[PDB]
Design an enzyme around this catalytic site. Structure first.
Site, short mmCIF file in Angstrom:
data_model
loop_
_atom_site.label_atom_id
_atom_site.label_comp_id
_atom_site.label_asym_id
_atom_site.label_seq_id
_atom_site.Cartn_x
_atom_site.Cartn_y
_atom_site.Cartn_z
N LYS A 198 6.98 -13.06 -11.51
CA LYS A 198 5.75 -12.31 -11.21
C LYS A 198 5.08 -11.78 -12.48
CE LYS A 198 7.47 -10.87 -6.61
NZ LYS A 198 6.39 -11.29 -5.67
N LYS A 216 -4.01 -8.12 0.81
CA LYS A 216 -4.24 -6.68 1.06
C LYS A 216 -5.32 -6.10 0.14
CE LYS A 216 0.75 -6.40 2.08
NZ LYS A 216 2.09 -5.82 1.70
O1 62N Z 1 10.16 -11.79 -0.08
C1 62N Z 1 10.65 -12.90 -0.31
N1 62N Z 1 11.98 -13.11 -0.43
C2 62N Z 1 12.94 -12.18 -0.29
O2 62N Z 1 12.75 -10.98 -0.08
C3 62N Z 1 14.37 -12.69 -0.49
C4 62N Z 1 15.42 -12.17 0.27
C5 62N Z 1 16.73 -12.62 0.08
C6 62N Z 1 16.99 -13.60 -0.89
C7 62N Z 1 18.43 -14.11 -1.14
F1 62N Z 1 18.61 -15.31 -0.62
F2 62N Z 1 19.31 -13.29 -0.60
F3 62N Z 1 18.65 -14.20 -2.44
C8 62N Z 1 15.94 -14.10 -1.67
C9 62N Z 1 14.64 -13.65 -1.48
N2 62N Z 1 9.87 -13.98 -0.45
C10 62N Z 1 8.40 -13.88 -0.37
O3 62N Z 1 7.92 -14.19 0.97
C11 62N Z 1 6.52 -13.89 1.11
C12 62N Z 1 6.18 -14.13 2.59
O4 62N Z 1 6.07 -15.53 2.86
C13 62N Z 1 5.67 -14.73 0.13
O5 62N Z 1 4.32 -14.28 0.16
C14 62N Z 1 6.19 -14.63 -1.31
O6 62N Z 1 5.52 -15.59 -2.14
C15 62N Z 1 7.72 -14.85 -1.35
O7 62N Z 1 8.24 -14.69 -2.68
C1 PLP Z 2 2.72 -6.61 0.82
C2 PLP Z 2 3.97 -5.96 0.26
C3 PLP Z 2 4.83 -6.71 -0.56
C4 PLP Z 2 4.52 -8.13 -0.93
O1 PLP Z 2 3.72 -8.20 -2.14
P1 PLP Z 2 3.60 -9.50 -3.07
O2 PLP Z 2 2.61 -9.04 -4.06
O3 PLP Z 2 3.12 -10.58 -2.18
O4 PLP Z 2 4.95 -9.68 -3.63
C5 PLP Z 2 5.97 -6.13 -1.09
N1 PLP Z 2 6.28 -4.81 -0.79
C6 PLP Z 2 5.45 -4.06 0.02
C7 PLP Z 2 5.82 -2.64 0.34
C8 PLP Z 2 4.29 -4.63 0.56
O5 PLP Z 2 3.56 -3.95 1.29
#
Ligand code: 62N
Ligand code: PLP
Ligand code: 62N
Ligand code: PLP
Lengths: 810, 810
Positions: B548, B654
Site C-alpha cells: 500500500k 468511500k
Molecule cells: O482485507 C483483505 N484481506 C484480509 O484482511 C486478510 C485476512 C487474512 C489473511 C490471511 F490469510 F490470514 F493471511 C490475509 C488477508 N483483503 C482486501 O479485500 C478487499 C475487499 O475485497 C479489497 O478491496 C482489498 O484490495 C483486499 O486487499
Molecule cells: C474501508 C475500510 C478499510 C478498507 O480500506 P482500503 O483502503 O480499501 O484498504 C479498512 N479499514 C476500515 C475501518 C475501513 O472502513
C-alpha cells in the site's frame, strides 16, 4: 385455588397476561408458533422480575436517605435454589400468575420445573446463608449478601452402575433473568507483589491486578415491599509476534478462573492456591464497597456504628487483616485505633468442631500471594500473645496453644484463632455446639474473653420450607389460625388446642398422603422406579459423611431384610427407605457408601419374598429443589450423627415443620427440637456426648460389639463374603475394615439402641391416629426454628440493630 | 433538523420517550438520579431495538412461508462498526429519536459515541461482508451472514513513544443489546478422531466434541421493512480427586478458546492450529443449519435450487469437503451426484494475488485434526487431475501446477485450488484484478474451465458511507434531486447538470469546510493536537502494508519539508497530512513504518520555520467509527499501491462519495473510478501493470534512482544519518536497507511522477472554484460503486435470484 397464595384480581391478571406477551415478543424475540416451554418460563420470569424493580430501587434509595447501620453477610456459599416461586410467594402474586398462565393455556407448575437451581453452595452452611438473606429482608434490616458468582456451582450427580459420577453444573447456559450485571462498579483486587517500607509506612507494590465485576440479585422480604441485594463478584482480566499476541489474549483465562467453580469439598480442608485466591477476591472487593458506601454517608470512629461484618465460617476471615491493611496503610490510622474499629466491626460464626474441616493455611502460600497480610497477621499474633502472657503469667503451653501461628513441619496460620482475636462476637449454631466450643477447642480463648462467646441456634425460613414446598399444609393451618404465622412462626403453638380435633387430625394425614402420592408419581415419571405409597417413608437426605452415619442406616436396612428372610410370613410395617446426598469428589469412603446403598437396593428390591414390604432407593442429585419435593412427603426423618459431631443440622428442622417424626441422637439442634416438642414426641436413641467421651477414655473396641451381637455379625459376614457384590466379592472390604478397626464415629456402639428405637417407630405407625397426633405436637412446637427468630437474635445481640415488620410503601 | 433523517411526528416522539423511560427503569434498573451517559445510551439502544423485532419476526416467517432460494454468506470476518445510528437511518427514526432525546434533556450524538465498534474484522475483506449484508437486506434477498462471535475483535491500537502497542478489544464488557443468544439451537462440531471403514462406507469415530451456540443479530434493509439475520457461532464445552475435578472444569477453556479472538494477521498466512479449528468450526455448524432449514421446506437434486453458499476468500473453503462428507457419509449419496450438488451450490471470491496471503495448510495438521476431510480432498484431487490429463494429454507440468496437493519439504493443500475445483463460479473484485487472475495465478484453471471465471467489482453501502457519516452532503444532494438516490446511487449522475451552478458549488464547499472544522475539533478534544482547518486535508487511511506504500507518502512528506527548509519565504499550499492504520502484530516492517511516520511528525510539527504550513499526524486506532469521521473531512485521498497489488480497495470509493479528490496509481478499482469520472478529473500517476512487468524482466535496481534523483538521495542520507532519530542514529537502517536492496514494491520507481503529480494537486487547490467543480464531477459519477449494484450482479450472475425493492408490510 388456595387462600395463602394471594388474590387473583381481574385487573392484575389482565396486566400480567399482556406483560407476559410483551416479554415473549420483545424480550425473547419469539412468536407463539415456535415458543417452547423454556420460552414461556423466561417470559414469566421476566414478568415477575418487573414487579421487583420498583421496590428494589425504592428500598435502596430509602437506605441512602435514612442511613441505617448496614449488615454485610460474607460467605463463599449461597445455596439459593430456584427463585421464581419464592418471588411470587413474597410478592403475593402466586394465584394471579397461576390464573394468568392458565388463561394463556399453560401450566405454571410445569414452567417452574424448567428453572435451574442456583447451586452456589455445598449444604447446610450455604443454605443457612440463603435462609438468612430471606429473614433479613423480611425483618427490614439494611442487609447485603456478598459472595462469588461461580460459573459452575455444585456438580450434578449421576449414578452409573451404582457409582457417583460428577458433571459440570452449567447453570448459566440459558441465562439468569434475576441478576443484573453492574460492569460500571468494577473494582481492582491485588495479588502477589512485595512489601516496600517507606518513611510514611508500608507499601504493597508490584502486584498483579484482577478486576471484580459485581452482579446484583434482588432479595424480596415477605410482603413488606422490602427488596435487599445479594452482590456476587465475577473475575475479569484487565485489558493491558502473532503467536505471542494470541497467547496473551488466551492467558486472560488464568485471571478469570478465580470465579469459575465452587470447591465441592465439605469434609476436609485443602490448602489449594485457587481457593485462597477466591477467599481474598471476595474479601478485598467487598471491603472496598463497604468503605465507599460508608464514606458517602473521614471519621472511622463511627465505622462500627454504621457497619457490621458477619463472617460465615473462617472462609472470609481475610476480612480482618484486610480491614487493618486499608485502615493503617491507606487511611493512615494508628494501629491501636484501627484494631479497635476492626474488632467492633467483625463477628465470626463457627459451623464445626471436626479438626480436619478447620482452615489452616500454609505460611508459604500467604507469603507469596499476600505478603502484606502475613506481616499484619504476625503483628496481630504478637500483640494478642502479649495479652495472654499478661493474663496467665508463666503459662507457656497456653501461649503455644492459642497462637495464630502453628509450628511444625510446615508452618500454618489457624484462621479460627485469627477470627476469635479480631471479632467482638463468636457464636456456635446450636446450644450444645456452643457449649462444646467453650469446653473443648476454644476453651483457652473463652477463659481469656468469656464475653465474646455466644449461641445463635440455627433456623430455616418458613416461606420456602412450608408455604412454597407444602401449600396443602400451609392452607389447613391458615384455616384454623389465620396467616400471621408465616412471619411469626411461634403462632403455630395455637395448633396444640387441635390435637384432639378429629377434623384437623384427618386433614393433616390427608395432606401427607397427597404429598406422598405426588412424590411417588415423581419417581416413576422422572426416574422409572416403583414405590408403595402406603409404606412408611423413611428418609435420610444430606451430604454423605462418615459422621452423619448413613452407614448406621444401612445396617438397619440390612437387619430388616435379614429378619424378613428369616420369618417371611410374619407381618412387618412396610417401608420405603430413601437415602440421598452428594459425596465430595475426593472422599473415597463416602463414594463407597453410595455404592453400598445402591448395592443393598439391588438385592432387596428384586427379592420376591420381600415383595412391597421393603424398598431401598438412592435419591439421585439431591439439591434444594429436590428437598422441596421429598421433605413434604416424608414420614420419618433420620438425624443419626454421632453425638457431638453435627454442629446444628437444619434439614432436621425442615422435616419437623413438614409433618415427619424424627429418629435421632442427642446432637446439634435435635436436643432443642426434643426440648420444644417434648421427649415423648421424639424418637431419641444412643450415646450422649458424655457417653462418647467415656468410651474414648476407655478405648473404642468394635470387635466387642461384633462378638456379642449375632445380628450384627451376620451383616459383617454378608458384607465380607460378597453377598451384596457376587461378581466382586471383596468390593466392600474397605468399609468392613474401617468399621472393625478404624471407626472414628462408633457406628457399632449405637446399633442395638437404634434398631430397638426403629421397632418403636414401626409400632406407632401401625396406629395412624396416634402417629398424626404426635406429628401435630411436632409441627405445633417448631416455631423456635424459624430463621426470623435466629436473625432477630443476631440483630439484637451481635449487630446492635432493631428488626422491623413495618411495610415500605408500594 | 434535516429532511433525509425522517419525520418527527408528535405521536412517535411521545411513544419513544415513554419506552426510553421504561427501559431505563425496568431493563437497566436505574433512576434518573444516578444514571450515567452509558445508561442513557443503553436505554436508547433498547428502545430502537424494539422497533426491529416485529419486522425481524415477520421477515423470517415470510421466508418460511414463501420458501425462496437462500443465500448463505460465509466469512471469518464481519467488520460491522456501530449499530445504533445505522438502525435509526434504516428505520427512518433518526429525527424522531433526536427530538425525543432532546426533550429529555440529552444530546443523541454524545450517546452515539458510547457504543463500542463491533470490530470483528481486519480491513477491506471484513468491511465488504458488512456492506454486503446491508445491500442484501435492502434488495430483499433471503440472505444470512454466518461467522464467529469473537470475544475479542481487532486489537485497540495505542501509540507509546511512537510505537504501536496492542491491547485487547473487550467489546462485550458492557453487553451487546443487538444480539440475541439462541442456546436452544446449539449444535455439535467434531474434531480429531479417526476414520473407520465399514461395509456401509466410511465412519468418522472417536472424535472430540465442541458445541456451537448461535447468536443472532438483526440486519435491517433501507426502509423496506426487511430484517435479515447475521448468525455468529460461540464455542461451548459439553458438560461431560478434588484437584482433578477442579482441573477438569477449568480445562473447559480449551474448547471455548476457539471463539476467543480474531487473528489480526492480514499480511502473511500462518498455519496455526487454532485458526484451522476456527475455520472448521464456522463451516460445520453453518452447514448443519443450512441442511436442517433445507429439509424443513430428502431430494438433494433440488439442493442447489434452494441454497447458494458464497465463500468470502478461502477461509471457509472447508465447506466444500464438509458438504461432500455430509452428502456421501451421512445421506448416502453416490460420489458423482454429491459432487454435482456441491459445485452448483458453492462460489468463491478471491481478494489478493500476493502469494504469502494465500492459504496453504500443512497436510499433517489436516491429518490429525480432520482425517476424513483429508481423505475427501485427496479424492477430489485425483478426479480433478484425471480431467486435466484428459483435456491436456501429456502435459505433466500442468498436472503438478494445478494439483490441490503441493509437493516439497512439507506437503500442503492449496485451498484456492480446492475452491476453484469445487465452485461453479470464481470472481475477482475489480476488473483489472479479475483479468490478472485469468492471466497469471489461475491461468491453468481458466484454460480448463473459462465459464467459471467472473468479475464482480466491489462497492460500499451509501447508507453508512454517505447518509450516516455525511448528513450535510446527503441533504444538499436531496434538495436538488430528491431522496431516491440513497437506494439507487446511479441517480447521482443528475448532479452533473449542477457543475456550473454557483449555489451548489458554494454549498458543496461549505459542507466540506464544516466537516473539516468538526474533525479539527475532534482532534483537539480527544487527542490534544492542533491543526489548521484551512489547509488541504491529505489523508491515507488503511491497514499498514508494504504494498500500500505508506512509505512513498512518507518520502513526499519529507520532500515538502526539505523544500520549505531550502526556500522558507516561498509560498506553498498548506497541508495537514494524516496517515492512519493498524499493523499486524508480527509484521516488523509495518511497525517500523508507523515509527517512521511519528518520527517525521516529531521533527516537522516542531520546526518554527515550517509554521502551520505542514503538519504530519498519525491517526491512532483507525477503525470503522473513525473512518466515518475522517473520510467526510478529507480533501485528498491517497490510493498509491504498486500497480497489480491492491485487488480492489474500498476506502477509495468511500472518499470519492464524500467529496475528496483522488491521487492514485492505475490499480484495483482506481481504474474503474477514473473511467467513470474521466481521467481529467483524477490525479493518476506512476507505472501501470505493464510497466511493472517490464521492470521485473530487466531487474529492479533501486540504486539507479538514488544516483539520478538528488532530492531522493538527500532523504535517504537523512534517514541513514539519524536526522529523524538523533538519540538512536541507526533506528531506520532496516527501512533504508529494504528500500535500497530488497523492495518488492518499487517505491523509488514511482517517486518522481508522484511528487510531480502532488504539485498538480496543490496547484488546483489554489483555485477553490475549480477544485469544487472537479469534486462535483467525482461525486456525480460514484454511483457504480454502490454495493447495491455489486450485490445485484452476484444475485443475477452467480446465485440465480432476482433482487427486489418491494416493501414488506409494517
Ligand atoms: O482485507 C483483505 N484481506 C484480509 O484482511 C486478510 C485476512 C487474512 C489473511 C490471511 F490469510 F490470514 F493471511 C490475509 C488477508 N483483503 C482486501 O479485500 C478487499 C475487499 O475485497 C479489497 O478491496 C482489498 O484490495 C483486499 O486487499
Ligand atoms: C474501508 C475500510 C478499510 C478498507 O480500506 P482500503 O483502503 O480499501 O484498504 C479498512 N479499514 C476500515 C475501518 C475501513 O472502513
Ligand atoms: O455445611 C457445612 N460446612 C460446609 O459445607 C463446609 C465447606 C467447606 C469446608 C472446608 F473448609 F473447605 F473444608 C468444610 C465444610 N457445615 C454445616 O453448617 C450448617 C449450618 O450452620 C450446620 O447445620 C451443620 O451442622 C454443619 O455441618
Ligand atoms: C437443608 C439442606 C442441607 C442441610 O441438611 P443437614 O441435614 O442439616 O446436613 C443440605 N443440602 C440441602 C439441599 C438442603 O436443603
Amino acid at each position: 385455588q388456595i387462600s395463602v397464595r394471594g388474590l387473583a384480581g381481574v385487573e392484575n391478571v389482565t396486566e400480567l397476561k399482556k406483560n407476559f406477551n410483551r416479554h415473549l415478543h420483545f424480550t425473547l424475540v419469539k412468536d407463539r408458533n415456535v415458543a417452547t416451554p423454556r420460552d414461556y418460563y423466561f417470559a414469566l420470569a421476566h414478568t415477575v422480575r418487573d414487579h421487583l424493580v420498583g421496590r428494589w430501587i425504592r428500598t435502596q434509595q430509602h437506605y441512602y436517605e435514612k442511613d441505617p447501620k448496614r449488615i454485610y453477610y460474607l460467605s463463599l456459599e449461597f445455596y439459593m435454589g430456584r427463585t421464581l416461586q419464592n418471588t411470587m410467594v413474597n410478592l403475593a402474586l402466586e394465584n394471579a400468575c397461576d390464573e394468568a398462565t392458565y388463561q394463556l393455556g399453560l401450566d405454571m407448575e410445569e414452567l417452574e420445573e424448567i428453572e435451574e437451581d442456583a447451586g452456589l453452595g455445598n449444604g447446610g452452611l450455604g443454605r443457612l446463608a440463603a435462609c438468612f438473606l430471606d429473614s433479613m429482608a423480611t425483618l427490614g434490616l439494611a442487609a447485603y449478601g456478598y459472595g462469588i458468582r461461580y460459573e459452575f456451582g455444585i456438580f450434578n450427580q449421576k449414578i452409573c452402575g451404582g457409582w457417583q459420577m460428577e458433571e459440570a453444573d452449567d447453570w448459566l447456559r440459558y441465562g439468569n433473568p434475576w441478576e443484573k450485571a453492574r460492569p460500571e462498579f468494577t473494582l481492582p483486587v491485588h495479588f502477589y507483589g512485595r512489601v516496600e517500607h517507606t518513611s510514611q509506612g508500608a507499601k504493597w507494590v508490584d502486584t498483579q491486578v484482577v478486576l471484580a465485576m459485581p452482579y446484583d440479585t434482588p432479595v424480596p422480604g415477605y410482603r413488606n415491599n422490602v427488596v435487599n441485594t445479594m452482590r456476587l463478584w465475577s473475575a475479569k482480566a484487565p485489558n493491558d509476534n502473532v503467536g505471542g499476541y494470541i497467547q496473551a489474549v488466551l492467558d486472560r483465562n488464568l485471571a478469570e478462573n478465580i470465579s469459575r467453580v465452587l470447591y465441592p469439598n465439605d469434609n476436609f480442608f485443602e490448602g489449594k492456591e485457587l481457593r485462597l485466591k477466591q477467599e481474598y477476591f471476595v474479601v478485598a472487593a467487598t471491603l472496598q464497597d463497604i468503605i465507599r458506601r460508608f464514606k458517602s454517608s473521614t471519621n472511622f470512629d463511627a465505622f462500627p456504628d454504621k457497619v457490621a461484618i458477619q463472617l460465615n465460617d473462617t472462609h472470609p476471615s481475610l476480612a480482618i487483616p484486610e480491614l487493618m491493611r486499608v485502615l493503617v496503610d491507606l487511611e493512615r490510622l494508628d494501629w491501636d485505633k484501627a484494631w479497635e474499629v476492626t474488632v467492633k466491626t467483625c463477628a465470626y460464626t463457627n459451623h464445626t468442631v471436626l479438626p480436619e474441616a478447620l482452615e489452616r493455611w500454609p505460611v508459604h502460600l500467604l507469603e507469596t500471594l499476600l505478603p502484606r497480610h502475613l506481616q499484619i497477621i504476625y503483628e496481630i499474633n504478637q500483640r494478642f500473645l502479649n495479652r495472654v502472657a499478661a493474663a496467665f503469667p508463666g503459662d507457656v503451653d497456653r501461649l503455644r496453644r492459642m497462637s495464630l501461628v502453628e509450628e511444625g513441619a510446615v508452618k500454618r496460620i489457624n484462621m479460627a484463632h485469627l477470627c476469635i482475636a479480631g471479632s467482638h462476637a463468636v457464636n456456635g449454631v446450636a446450644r450444645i455446639h456452643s457449649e462444646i466450643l467453650k469446653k473443648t477447642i476454644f476453651k483457652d480463648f473463652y477463659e481469656l474473653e468469656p464475653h465474646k462467646f455466644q449461641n445463635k441456634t440455627n433456623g430455616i425460613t418458613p416461606r420456602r420450607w412450608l408455604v412454597l414446598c407444602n401449600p396443602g399444609l400451609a392452607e389447613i393451618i391458615a384455616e384454623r389460625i389465620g396467616e400471621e404465622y408465616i412471619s411469626d412462626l411461634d403462632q403455630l403453638r395455637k395448633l396444640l388446642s387441635y390435637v384432639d380435633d378429629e377434623a384437623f387430625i384427618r386433614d393433616v394425614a390427608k395432606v401427607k398422603q397427597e404429598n406422598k402420592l405426588k412424590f411417588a408419581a415423581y419417581l416413576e415419571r422422572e426416574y422409572k422406579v416403583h414405590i408403595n405409597p402406603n409404606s412408611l417413608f423413611d428418609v435420610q437426605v444430606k451430604r454423605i459423611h462418615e459422621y452423619k452415619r448413613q452407614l448406621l442406616n444401612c445396617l438397619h436396612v440390612i437387619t430388616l431384610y435379614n429378619r424378613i428372610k428369616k420369618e417371611p410370613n410374619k407381618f412387618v410395617v412396610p417401608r420405603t427407605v430413601m437415602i440421598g446426598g452428594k459425596a465430595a469428589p475426593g472422599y473415597h469412603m463416602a463414594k463407597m457408601i453410595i455404592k453400598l446403598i445402591t448395592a443393598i437396593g439391588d438385592v432387596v428390591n428384586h427379592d420376591p419374598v420381600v415383595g412391597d414390604r421393603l424398598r431401598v432407593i438412592f435419591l439421585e442429585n439431591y439439591r434444594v429443589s429436590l428437598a422441596e419435593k421429598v421433605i413434604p412427603a416424608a414420614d420419618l426423618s433420620e438425624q443419626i450423627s454421632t453425638a457431638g459431631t453435627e454442629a446444628s443440622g437444619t434439614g432436621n428442622m425442615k422435616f419437623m415443620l413438614n409433618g415427619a417424626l424424627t429418629i435421632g441422637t442427642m446432637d446439634g439442634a435435635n436436643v432443642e427440637m426434643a426440648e420444644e416438642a417434648g421427649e415423648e414426641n421424639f424418637f431419641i436413641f444412643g450415646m450422649r456426648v458424655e457417653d462418647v467421651d467415656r468410651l474414648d477414655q476407655r478405648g473404642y473396641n468394635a470387635q466387642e460389639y461384633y462378638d456379642r451381637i449375632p445380628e450384627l455379625r451376620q451383616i459383617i459376614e454378608q458384607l465380607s463374603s460378597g453377598f451384596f457384590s457376587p461378581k466382586q466379592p471383596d468390593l466392600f472390604k474397605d468399609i468392613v475394615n474401617m468399621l472393625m478397626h478404624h471407626d472414628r464415629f462408633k457406628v457399632f456402639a449405637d446399633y442395638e439402641e437404634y434398631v430397638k428405637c426403629q421397632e418403636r417407630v414401626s409400632a406407632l405407625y401401625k396406629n395412624p391416629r396416634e402417629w398424626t397426633r404426635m406429628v401435630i405436637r411436632n409441627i405445633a412446637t417448631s416455631g423456635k426454628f424459624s430463621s426470623d427468630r435466629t436473625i432477630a437474635q443476631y440483630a439484637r445481640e451481635i449487630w446492635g440493630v432493631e428488626p422491623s415488620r413495618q411495610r415500605l410503601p408500594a
